[PDB]
Each structure stands twice: as C-alpha cells, then as structure tokens.
Design a protein around this ligand. Structure first.
Ligand SMILES: O=P(O)(O)OC[C@H]1O[C@H](OP(=O)(O)O)[C@H](O)[C@@H]1O
Ligand SMILES: O=P(O)(O)OC[C@H]1O[C@H](OP(=O)(O)O)[C@H](O)[C@@H]1O
Ligand SMILES: O=P(O)(O)OC[C@H]1O[C@H](OP(=O)(O)O)[C@H](O)[C@@H]1O
Ligand SMILES: O=P(O)(O)OC[C@H]1O[C@H](OP(=O)(O)O)[C@H](O)[C@@H]1O
Ligand SMILES: O=P(O)(O)OC[C@H]1O[C@H](OP(=O)(O)O)[C@H](O)[C@@H]1O
Ligand SMILES: O=P(O)(O)OC[C@H]1O[C@H](OP(=O)(O)O)[C@H](O)[C@@H]1O
Lengths: 321, 321, 321, 321, 321, 321
C-alpha cells in the first residue's frame, strides 16, 4: 500500500465537505482511483490490485449515506477484480482501472444531462418550483426548463445547517432563473404558491424511500398535503443495492459545530446536546416520480432499477475485500 | 401630543425586536402607557386623553401580527375612554390609565403561571417535548413539569431566521431541563421520538387557527402525521377579536437581512428576492388543545373565548380613535 | 280556512322551483302570511288564528330540506300564537302577523348584506373563487369583494340538473366579475387554480354538517384534498333546530324529468331508474368557516347558534298545531 | 399523397366525436390505413410508403389525449416501415399494412373480451357498481359479471358535457342489467351504497396515473374516501410510452358549445369564458387495480407494461416521419 | 366513621366488576350513600357529615376511570355539604343525602331513556349497527330504533377480556333485535357492511376525547376510514370536569388473570408480562356526535357541557374533604 | 385410488387446525404426497399418476385461503405430470414425486431462515415489535434480531378466536425474548410505544394486498396512522397466482364454536349468528415492505414475484386434473 497523495486529499475533501453532492463525490472517488493507477510505481499486477483495494477502502470510509460513492468504486473495482482474477499484466490492469473510471465519470455527466431533458418535460410554462439543498440533477431539470423558454421561478430553501441553498440560489440566479429565497421553516407557508417540487437524492431504497438532505421529508410531506408533485431527480447509481437484502442506510451525524459555531458552542451548558443529522428519509407514498437517465418511474419501481443493474453483485462479497 | 421619551424607546425596541414575544410586547406597551400617564405635564383631562390616544397609536403601529399588543392597549384604553366620557379630573384619569395598566401586567404574569400549572398536568414522566421559537407560556409548562419531578427532555428547534431557539435552549438548560438542539428541518426526523409538542401563539382566530412563529405549521403537520399531541399555550389576550368579523390577520414580513446578512446580501444578484415571513398559520385540525389561564379547550372553542370577553367591543370603533 | 289566493300561488311557485334559493323561499313564505293577514275577511281573532295556521301548513309542506322556510314561519307564528293566547283583537293579531313578517323579510336582507361584508374580508386581491349553484349569500360575498377593488375571478360550476350555474354566471358576469364556467365534473381538475371556495346552505346541523345543492360535498372533499378554504355563507335561520334532538334532515328527491326530459325519458327501458337528490350533506371536517350575519364561526359552533336562538322552542310543540 | 376519401371521413368523424371511445378510435384509424392500402392506385413501393405516412399524420392530428390511437398507427407503421426499409414489392407492402391493421383490430376485440373475463372475477354477487362515461372495456366487465349470474346493479353517471352516460345506461339496460342514473354531482351521495367502481382509460402513464373522461378523478377521490375499489379497465395499448421520457399528456379542450349550446352561448356576456376539458388525471394512489388483457396489476406496474412492449421504440423517432 | 355494611359490599362489587357499566356504578354509589344516611345510628349532624365523607372516599377509591362515579358522589355531597355548613339538624341532613341520591338515580334513568329517544332518530330503517362492550346508553338507542319499527341488525364485538359482548348479544337478541357476533379483530372486515357505529363512554374530556372500553379507539379509527358515523351515547355526568384544568384521566389496569386465567398464567415464563388496560382513548376527529339527554353535540362542544354544569366546582376543593 | 392412510390423517389435521400456519400446511401436504409415492402398492405409472392426482385433490380441498398449500402441490405435481407425459417407469415417477417434495420442504426451511436474516436487518437495537398470530416467518425475524444482540421486546396480540398469541408468547419467551401480552383490542393503545410491526401472510395478491389472520388489517391501519413500519414476512410460495387473472381469494369461515364454545353456544337465542372469518385483507398502502427469501420488496412488486415464478402455469390448467 504505497497510496498516492491525491487519494488522501480527495478523502479529506469528501469528509470536510469541500467536495459534496452525491453525484460529485462519486466522480471524485473514481477520479481518485484513476490518479492512483496512473501514478503507481508498481512492478507486479498483485501489487496494483493491493493499492486500488486500499485506496477503495479509504474512499469508502469517508461518508456512509450517499450510495453513489460505493457504486462508483464498485463500477471500477468489479472490473479491475475480474481482470486480475483472469490474469492481466501491469499496464492492462492499470488501464482497466483508468478506463473503468473514465466510463463512470462520463456516464455520470451524461446521466445528469439526460435527467434534465426528461425532468424538464414535467415543468410547465409559468411554474413555481420549490427545491431543497444543492442537487446537480435537480438543477439540471430547472436549467433545461428555463432554456426551453418556460418562465419559471424557483423557491430555494436555505437548507441549514451548511447553507447549501446559498449555492443553489446563486447558481440559478446567474442562469437568468429568478429565485425566491426562504428559510426552511417557511416551506408550508409557500407550498400553496408552488406548482412542483424538484429535489435530489443521496440514496434510494428497495421500497422507494428516498434518503436526501435533512428537511426533504418535511417538504415532501406538505407537498403531499397540498397535492404538489414531488419529483426526485437521481442517477441510477444513487439507488442502494444492500437495501434489497434488508440493510437500513446509515444516517450520518456531522459535527455539532456546523449547527452552533465552536466559539459559541463551548460556552453553552453541558446539558444541551446539539444533534446534526445530515439526511432524513422520505417515504415513497409522498414521492410522485423519480427522474433517472433511463426514465420516469414511480418510486415503487426502485426495486426494478436495483434488480436489473446491481442485484447480481449481492450473492458475491464486496469487490475490494 | 407631548409624548414622553419612553413610549418612543419602547416602540423602537418592539420594532427592532429587542423586545419580543407576544406576551411581553403587550406588557411593554401597557408599561409604556403607564409611564406616559405618570410623567404627563398635562393640565386638563382632554389634554391627557389626547396624549394616551397618540401613545396608543404609536405602540399599535409597531408590529401587526401579535394581537396581544392591541388587546393590552384596549384593556387600558377601553377604561380610560369610559372615565373621560363620563367626566373625570386629571389625577382620576391619570390613575385609571396607571391602574388599568397595572392590572394587565399582573394579569399576564398570573396567566402565564397558571398556564404552566394547567399544561404541565398533560406532560407525563419521561416525555420528550418538541417546542419551537421562544414562548414564555410554552416554557411555563415545561418548567412546571420539571418542578413536579417528571424527567422530561426538550427538543429545541433553532427557529431561524432570528435564532430564538438559542434563547430557549439556554433558558431550559439552566433550569436543569436537558435539551436536544436541532435545526428546523430536522423536525420530522425527530417527531418519532417526541411524545408531545408544546408551542405558543401570537394570534388565535375565531375558527381556532393559530398564528405563531414561522415553522409552527410544519411541526404541527408532522406531529399530526405521527399522532403526537400539539398543545398551544396561550393567554386569552392572544385571541383575535377582529377575526370574528372576517378579518384575516396580517402576516408581518421582516427585513431580508435577518435571513442573509447585509454585507453578504448586497453582493447577490438582483434576480434573487429574499422573503422573510415572521409567522405562519396552523389549522385547527392539527392542534389538540389550547392551554389558557381559564383552561384547556379544543381549538374550535376559540370562538367562545372571543365571544365572552372581546365581542362587545366590535359593534364599537377602536377606543383610541 | 278561507285561505287567500296568493298563499296557494306562492306554494306552487315554491314546489315547481319558480321561487328557489333557501333565503328567498323563506321571505316568500313570510310574504305569503303577510298577504293572508292583510286580505283576511275574518271577524274574530280565533278565525284569523285558524287561517294563518292553515296557510302555515300549506307553505311548510312545499319543500322539506331548507329549514330557512320552517324558521320564517316560526318567527311569524311563535309571535302570533303568544298574542292570541294572551288575548288580542282582530286588528292587533292581523298586525302582529304583518309586523312579524315585516321584521323577518328585512332581517334576511340585512343578514345577506352583512354576510358579504364579513365574507369579503376573507377574499384577497387576485383570488380565484370556486362556487356551486346559485346562493345569494355566497354571491353577496363575491360582489362585496369585487366592490372593495380586489381582482377576483369566479369559477361557476353549472350545477346540474336544474342549471343554477347559468343564473350565477350571468349575475356575476353582469357586475363586472369575470367568470369561468365549467361542468360539475371539472371541479377537481380546476381545484389547483382555485384559492377559495364560497358556497351557500339550505340547512346546517347541530354537529356542523352542511346540507346544500347536490355536488357541494364533492367540491368540499377535493377542496380539502388541496387545502383550499371552504367557506359556507349562511344566515342563522339556515341552521336546523330539530337536529339538536337527533332528527336527520330529509333529502328531497325531485322529479326524474329534471334530469332526463319527459319526451326522452318515456322512451327508455323500464329497468333504468333516474334518481334526483336535490341536496347532499357535507361533513364539518371539510368546512373551514361558516359566515353568518353574527360572524365567522368554525362549523362545530353550529350547535351554539342553535342553542342561543332556536333551542327554547324544542320543549314546545310547533307553533301552528 | 393521393389519399383515399375514407381516411378523411374517419378523421372528421373522430374529431366531431361521431366516432369516440379510445379503443374504437384506434380500430377506426387502423381501419382507415387498411382501406388506404387496399384502394391505393400506386405503382411503386416508395409511393405507397408516402401515402400511409400521410394518412398516418392526418389520423394522428385528430385528437391528442387517447394514446390508443398513436399506438394503433405505430403497430401498423412500425411494421410497414421495416418492410419498406428491408425492400419489398408493391403488393408485399400493401399486404403488410392490411395485415398489420387486421391483427390490431382483432387484438383489440380479444383484449376487451379478455378484460371482461378478468374483471368480472372481481365483481361479487349483489354488487352495486358505479361507472363513468361510456367505456367498452368497463362495460365488458359488467356484462360478463351479469352473464355469470351475479345480480349486479349499475350506477351510471350522466357524464356531462357530451352525455355519454345515456349511451351507457341504454346499453346495460338492454342486456338486462338494472341501472340507476344520476347526475355527476351525485357521485359522493351514492358512494356509500356502491361496492365497486369500474371505469375505463384514454391514457395510462409511466407512474400509473390514469387519464380518462372529465370527472373520473372526483369519483376516484371519493371512492378512496369510502374505501370502495376503483378498478380501471384498459387495454395495453392505452398505456402512454412518451411519459416514460417525461412527457405530460396533452389534455384536450373541446368546443365550449358542447357545454352551453351555440344559440344560447352567443347571447352571454363577453366576460364569461366556458372551459371544456374532455379529460382529467387521476393519481395512482386512488386506483386499486388496472385490469388488462395480460392481467390485473397495481397501478404502479404501468411502467412494466410500457417497458416490455413499447420501450424499444423510444430511442427511435416516430415510424411515419 | 361507623360505616354501614352495604357501602362496603357495593365497593367490593364495583371493584370486582360484579357491578359494572359507568351509569350503573354511579347509581350504585349514590344508592350506597342513601342506605348509609337511612341506617345511620348517628346523634349529631357533625357525626353524619363524617360518615358520608368516609363512605364517599371508600366509593371514590374503587375504580378511577369512569367519572360518572365521582359526579354521582359530588351531586350528593355538594348539597349535603352546603346544608351542614349552613346548619341543619340530623333528620334534615339525613334527608338532603337521601333526597339528593334519589334525584340522581332518577335523573340517570331519565337520561338513558331520553338518549335512546334522541339517538334512535339517527338510525334508519335497514341499518346495520356495530357496537362495542355493554353500554346501557348505546343499547337504549338500538332498542328505541327497533321499537320504532326500523329493521336493524346489530354487530356485537365480543369485547375481550371480560366478554361484555356476550351480555350485549343476549340482551338485544332477547328484545327481537338480530345480532351478528364477531371477535374484536373482525371489526374492519365488517366495517364495510356497517352503516352506523353506536358505542358508550366512561369519561368524555374537555377537548372531546372519549374514554371507553378497550378497543373503542380502533373501531372508531376504521369507522372513520370507511366514513361510517361513530355516535357516542353518554349522559352528561360522563363528562370529566378535572380535564378542564389539564388533568389526564387515569387508565385503569385490571388483573392480568382476566386475560390469561390464574391456573394457566402461573405456568408461563417470568419474562412474559400480561398487560390489561380496561380502557382506551378515542380522539374527537373520529367521533361524529355525542348523544346526551340535552341533545346531539359535536364532540368539540364537550367543553360547553362541562362549563355550564360542572365548572363552578373547580375553584373549590372536592366536597368530601 | 388406493390412497395411503397418512394422506387422510394429514388432511384431517389440516382441517381441524392441529396442523396450522401456512408454511407448515404446505410442507405437511408435500410430506403427504411423499409418503404416498413411497408406500404405493402400484404396478403401472398410470396407476401412480392417478393416486397422486387424488391425494392432491384431497389435500387441496382442506382449507382454501393459504395459497402456500396449492403451490406446494403444484411444485410437486407440475414435475410429476411432465415426467409421466414424457414417459417414465414406476420407480422414476415415484422418485420424481419424492424428490420434488424433498426440494420444497427444504426450500421452505431455507426461505424462512433467509427471511429472518433479511428481516432482522430492519430491526434496530431497543425496538418494540408488535406482532399478530403465530407466523414462523415473522418469528424468524425476531429471533435473528435477538441473536444479533439487539434488545428487543415483543408485543404479542392474543389473536382470537384460536389464541395463536399464546403459542407466540411462549415460543419467543423461551428464546430469552421478553414479551408483552395484550388482547387484540389493545393494539392502538400500544401502537405509540411500538417501533415496528412484523406479521406474516397466508396469501399475497397481484396488487400487493395481504391476506393474513383476522385482525392483521386493523393493526396495519393503526400502524399506518402512527407511521410505524408494517413489514410482512412471507415466502414466495405465499403469493397467489390466480389473482393475476382477477380471482379473489376465498376467505375461510370456520366453525362458530371456536368463538363461543359448543356447551355455551347451544343455549343462546336463535336470532344471534356467530360469524368467524379466519382471515382479513390488508391493503398495500398500509404495508411498508414484504420480506421474502429473494429480498425486500414494496408491496406493489408482488406482481413481479408472481410473473417470474408462477405466471407460466396460468395459460395451462391445474396439474392434477
Ligand atoms: O448528487 P446531486 O444531485 O448533485 O446532489 C444530491 C444530494 O447530495 C447532497 O448531499 P450532501 O451535500 O453530500 O450533504 C444533497 O442531499 C443533494 O440533494
Ligand atoms: O408570548 P409568548 O408565549 O412568550 O411567545 C409567543 C410567540 O411570540 C413569538 O414571536 P416573536 O418573537 O414576537 O416574533 C413566538 O412566535 C412565540 O411562539
Ligand atoms: O339561500 P341562498 O344563499 O340564496 O341559497 C342557498 C341554497 O339554496 C339553493 O337550493 P335550491 O335552489 O332551493 O334548490 C342552493 O342549494 C343554494 O346553495
Ligand atoms: O376505450 P373505451 O374503454 O371504450 O373507452 C375509454 C374512454 O374513452 C372515452 O373518451 P371519449 O369518449 O373518446 O371522449 C371515455 O373517457 C372512456 O372512459
Ligand atoms: O354507562 P354505560 O352506557 O351503560 O356503559 C358505559 C361504558 O362502561 C363500560 O365499562 P366497564 O364495564 O365499567 O368496564 C363500557 O366501557 C361501556 O362502554
Ligand atoms: O406461514 P407462517 O409464516 O408460519 O404463518 C403465516 C400465517 O398463517 C397463519 O394462519 P393459520 O394459523 O393457518 O390460520 C397466520 O395467519 C399466520 O400469519
């Protein structure tokens, strides 16, 4: 394990959330295996197979909740394993890693674009769209709907604690899309004026439940109370294979100082705990479609996305062990 | 109109929200009429009746949404008007103002205490209580339940944009009550662990709808989804007489810089608007009781609170015009 | 029983529905007792008390469902009975009938006006209002909201079988109020664009259930699904005293030829029955306020309207027996 | 483009709705391509491929909402295209069109029959069935349930504006099936006495939403409120492929004179608009099964009907362009 | 405290549930004070006031949940206290106790009869009525509806653990009323065939919640799911004054051997606990009316029953302390 | 048809419910065909094919509702038919029956184990689990969750009329799992303290509806009201193929003396009927996942379980006719 520096820097960027968003974290991790296999000072295949195994674990142990990341690594390492176990020279394996990781990064970019093309068709001229957090897939939809000539207006929820709504406001604002910026608490008060909800996903489960930024479940709840469509924009690599076998997705708890700043937090009584769930889970009865690069589906056909693509891997162990 | 300084300082403190909370704003305004009538350099009754009329308008025009304030002024000025129009000397009227405003301030303090006594009886040993904002009435309930020996734990929602949840956390924390501090978005994720919701009110309407800090409606929604009791703690002067005759309560929109700080806000594109509703409206089907100083009621008996106390005043004009 | 002609002509106009609408039917019936007592060729009091008793029964037996009618007659005949049983000359009783029936007709006109004043305050500039049938009380609200300067637009449901929506469209259209005319089936499809529902009542019960034109219950249902306010505009004489003692309101079934025309109906197979309920019942959980001349109430305070006004009469028999 | 007369006459019959019902419109259009290819005075293949392309567009541009029609044309023209582009003589192509259009017409008739066989098994002896409009598939179910010996009774909703319920009443009435005929507004009032709802479809979407005659959504709503099964009877060619890629189905607005007759309509104020949506959309949470010729499915497996049959065509363009 | 034997025998009969039903327990307790004051060997008033105080506590401490019992004692002892504290001879006080307890027993019998008269008017010819437990008030309604000529059929739920449904089946069966007897679990399966639910109450609260035999809440839930009316039949002395001041009603837990017999229970592992709540609480949103001797009310007007009758006593202490 | 004794004894044990539980009944029936083919005194193949056909019908006609049983027989007799109709000697066919029935019994045992492995992953440390009846699959989940180290506590509903909850309490109690034993009526009162519901199935339909012990539907209802997960544990052979073609599952009505004992029942009036449905049907909107040996699915993917495994058999007749 003579792991390159960039693998470590990616991992610490993922953890700190300097690199964030579940699509991007997955491309960043595939990027990090790519730069491993390129800069490897390795002589044998069996030495390279060890390096990528180890870089895979490092990058897996960063953040648990977005399955995009585990699937990026699997899409690389399923292939690299089958090459090694069939028997391949140094520059063949090195290639298979760089070329698997090339495919995935490209595939992600295609999927996000193709999601906007498909999602925008469900946005109508004049629509007010409420969103949450900063999702590239979700934003792909709104952009495309604006480019088509529809006069949308987007309500951006600020998305505490990490303020991702500021990112989202600035990004849409600067494509010409008008934005209304509200605190998260104001989501029911403005649900009446909203015509559609577009939000993203970190993981999607067997039964169609959507794991996504904290607060997603509440917006979906009140959307459902007012009969406003909740549409989840999500690449197929966001769907969670392990949930097919009864696994619950771990909900990451991030540092309390994101909520109350360190300087302030340390002055507070011992008998206040600050809890910081980064995600919540939204049931499928509150979601209208999931928009993927293969199409619109009801949330309940999550299980079919998972069967046809990821199901074969579950009788096997993980491909970096 | 030779209005005293303290009336102006109260009014600007109310507007800036250095004085906040609907019970307190009402006692602050009654306090401000009291210090007018004491420091008046007035010779005639008809000169005093003008001063208090004018101080009444100043204090009314501060903030629209909490009806506690209009009712504090009415409780003073209904009486002061009936004295003047019956015919009373300078020091008789001066007294009637100081002594009406004495009664109200005391009445408020009694009511809040008596609300805790009544509300705490609905809190059970071991309960987790979710609250919102900073409400003295609500806090009166939690305190009393702690003093009775029940081992509660309170989830405090941070209550953006003005961070009132920090006030609430520190205040309960320092009575020995453990606190769990979450962002507002995390309210559904923690509704499962919550046993009761206790929140306050700015206005309560004819039909039982509750106007309260932005986000109240969402917590009540999900509480109702999980069958957790929403209990609203509120003095009878929080109920809104004008709504008996079809008036909708005005929902105050406060400065966008409370949301995004000035320094930051001015750098943002012109095509982002920041909206800041200070309140939302929660329907009566999502509220289990309202706890007042006269008792528990279903939300629908709001109309009876209003009939027996404030209804007589509605065929008349306002008592400072 | 030498009953005047106008009593018979009113009764047949009420039955055929040439005179319709529950407020109007009640004023028409009070008008019919008035013209009895004026044109009476009667010598004794005891002869007059018989005539009005008999004209009361005739007018009661026209149509069962709108309680406005029974209450108009009661408001006349409670008084006329107490005069006779105390002992009064011919022209005293004659007067008491004409002057009770004067009061009621005036009271109705005041109430309807005062309902519009109170209801319009719940209509906001820009609102789209969905209505049903032709209700003078409901229309009073929309008119007043237009006169105040609000730019409303009203969706009129055609209101089969008797096409009352044509009346409603023409009446609002000709006050300058724009109208969108839809079939009754189109009510959910357009509930999303609707901001408020304003409808009237034939009877309101103890528990707050609203009896009104067939189709009211469905509009209220879907309004509730979309969280659009259902507001029922209704005079206090629309509330049903007998329901306080467990009586269900009879739902009138009118001639099948209103549905399918005679010429056509007679050609159809024997094994098709055409049913024609004139009314349906809408539960109080789907109604937001009832607007009356005394004020806004939650539907559940129906029982209080009934207690304070009509309850005393229920230990007694009917005042024309 | 020397298009035969019958293509034009079919198209104008489809538009006027002299030919109506989504199964029938699709067989009428396949019938119209059949009579084109038979009566063609064409010398070349490339001349015939032009004629059918042009007759296909004519018949497609009639009415947008029922996808049965586009799928009838596709089932013909997918095949005729593959013959031409492989290379086939005049009488080979002519045949492929006549023989594709033979298959479809037969397939439709089989499917409708087979739907009744499958649907009737969900109807129980004594059931009251509420229906809407005139659907051959729906009627196939009720007929078969009657033939099996079950003593049903059908509530026919009149189905304004075009009165399709008259068709439905007469058709069932004349198979011995008793019918109760109500206005559309009366659907909740009679939902309590109803045991099952059987209705048809114009289009069914990816996510399981059902597009069908205006008023379907309301009946389904109240059915769901009372827990009465809504069963949608629909051939697989009713399902909408384009919705797999995010397309919303266009909802046809038909002439306002269907609602208010011309003679009458022209006398009305300019400021009344008459809107006439021919269809509405019913969400899948309000539908219990969809009965197709391949079987019962939950509405959410719409996406699987679409994947296995129509999905291959969506990477391609339309087969008449 | 030379307490008579019959007071002790009543108390042990109440505890064992040989005397059961909340109306009856209250008449049994009033009967027990009556036989105290008649058989008293007391010389002074102050000796008699002690005896009845002590017999009152004995009878209060039997079973907590039915408030009928506390109100029977209060109706006796409010009066007996006011006599003593005004100053009355032995045979005056003795009388006031016997004559207060005479009134109450009679009042109960009138109320139950009058409840059937009022409730039966809401039962329609042909109705299937589901009931629970054995309630005299509820049974009063069904009897009266049968006597009026309506052809009802009653579904009796067996009402574990104490099998009260056997009592109910036999009692209705023997008035000619047909009965269908089901286990409690079968209540949803038969809710579709049910037209009305009639059940009784032990306590009714300020906010309209109904405490009644274990299982009431579930029947009410599914009734509400199917839109079947839940009607609660209950005397005004069933309503709970203390809940006006925030008191929760204690839910009695009875011996586990009622569930699993002693002989059997003692053989079971130590790590099985048998819990036996005698009651549950049903929210007011699931109840359609409460039928009392003063009339039908929505459940939310519980607070008004309590205000006008029992509210005066709550600033005072209990009248046997 | 020289049927062996054990086939008859199994059948009468199945009917009496000495052998019960839908997994077990299916293994008992496969066991009974196995012992037929082993003890057959048959000379020809065509004689053996008759014996197993006849033993198949006997075992099918025992109890209708659990489809596990029909599928056990089909899994045996699909194979035995294809052997015979291809042409096989006595000891070849005899084997094919014994070896098909070997596979199924083993497959069942694997499936139940594998269900616990998959289900337990959805149970979390500290969970309170409510169950119903006695289901081996459900119990497999709870056991495995206990073995993993999670500190669960199970609420066992007694499950009248046949007291299966006693079986369940004793079985879990004796693996160290603490149990709380309640009557069935107490299920809502304890739903608040419950974290998960785990229950089994007799049949699962095309649309995802679950047929299971009487009372399942009610627990699922209130679970859904409180947002507690309902998870159904069920082998793939529990899913019902015939429902794919519109068949409703027959709901078995068992002897009324299970409810009220014979000795007692015969003394009761003629006009009491005792109804005893053994099962009820729970809609898929109230079920969160179904846990099978192939995985977690949303209830709506029932149709996919059925398509891939049992669908091929439905164009054919039954394989013992
Ligand atoms: O992958 P895209 O669509 O861009 O974003 C998907 C989701 O990832 C983000 O989480 P975080 O910022 O990693 O905490 C948000 O939850 C967002 O909805
Ligand atoms: O009167 P008390 O019970 O203390 O507080 C009542 C309510 O007043 C506050 O509003 P703001 O802080 O004036 O904006 C919050 O909405 C709080 O719930
Ligand atoms: O009394 P107003 O408010 O005018 O009308 C009240 C109601 O009376 C009408 O019934 P009908 O036309 O008598 O059958 C409609 O139901 C309308 O909503
Ligand atoms: O295809 P079938 O089952 O016969 O009818 C299906 C549907 O087509 C009809 O529409 P229209 O009459 O074309 O406007 C109705 O909406 C009906 O439910
Ligand atoms: O007073 P009545 O209407 O007769 O019965 C009222 C209620 O009292 C009974 O309780 P228990 O048998 O004392 O445990 C049942 O809960 C019944 O519904
Ligand atoms: O197959 P397993 O999971 O063991 O049990 C499944 C179901 O079978 C039982 O029915 P019965 O006892 O045959 O009446 C219960 O309904 C139980 O939930």
């Amino acid at each position: 394990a003579m792991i390159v520096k960039e693998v470590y820097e990616t991992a610490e960027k993922i953890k700190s959330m300097e690199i964030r968003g579940a699509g991007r974290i997955a491309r960043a991790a595939a990027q990090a295996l790519m730069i491993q296999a390129e800069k490897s000072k390795a002589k044998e295949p069996e030495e390279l197979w060890n390096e990528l195994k180890v870089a895979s674990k490092i990058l897996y142990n960063t953040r648990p909740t977005a399955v995009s990341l585990p699937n990026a690594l699997r899409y690389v390492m399923h292939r690299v394993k089958a090459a090694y176990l069939g028997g391949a020279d140094l520059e063949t394996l090195r290639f298979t890693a760089i070329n698997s990781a090339k495919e995935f990064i490209y595939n992600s970019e295609k999927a996000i674009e193709r999601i906007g093309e498909i999602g925008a068709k469900r946005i109508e001229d004049g629509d007010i769209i409420m969103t949450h957090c900063h999702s590239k897939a979700a934003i792909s939809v709104m952009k495309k709907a604006f480019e088509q000539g529809k006069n949308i207006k987007v309500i951006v929820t600020e998305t505490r604690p990490k303020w991702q709504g500021k990112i989202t406001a600035k990004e849409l604002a600067s494509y010409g899309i008008p934005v209304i910026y509200i605190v998260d608490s104001a989501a029911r008060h403005y649900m009446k004026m909203t015509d559609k909800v577009v939000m993203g996903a970190n993981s999607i489960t067997a039964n169609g439940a959507v794991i996504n930024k904290i607060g997603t479940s509440l917006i979906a709840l009140t959307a459902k109370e007012h009969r406003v469509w909740v549409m989840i924009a999500a690449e197929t690599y966001k769907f969670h294979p392990a949930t097919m076998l009864g696994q619950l997705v771990e909900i990451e708890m991030r540092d309390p100082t994101e909520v109350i700043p360190e300087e302030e937090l340390r002055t507070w009584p011992k008998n206040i705990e600050v809890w910081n769930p980064a995600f919540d889970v939204t049931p499928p009865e509150y979601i209208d479609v999931i928009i993927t690069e293969r199409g619109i589906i009801p949330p309940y056909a999550a299980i079919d996305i998972l069967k046809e693509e990821f199901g074969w891997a579950l009788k096997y162990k993980e491909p970096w062990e």
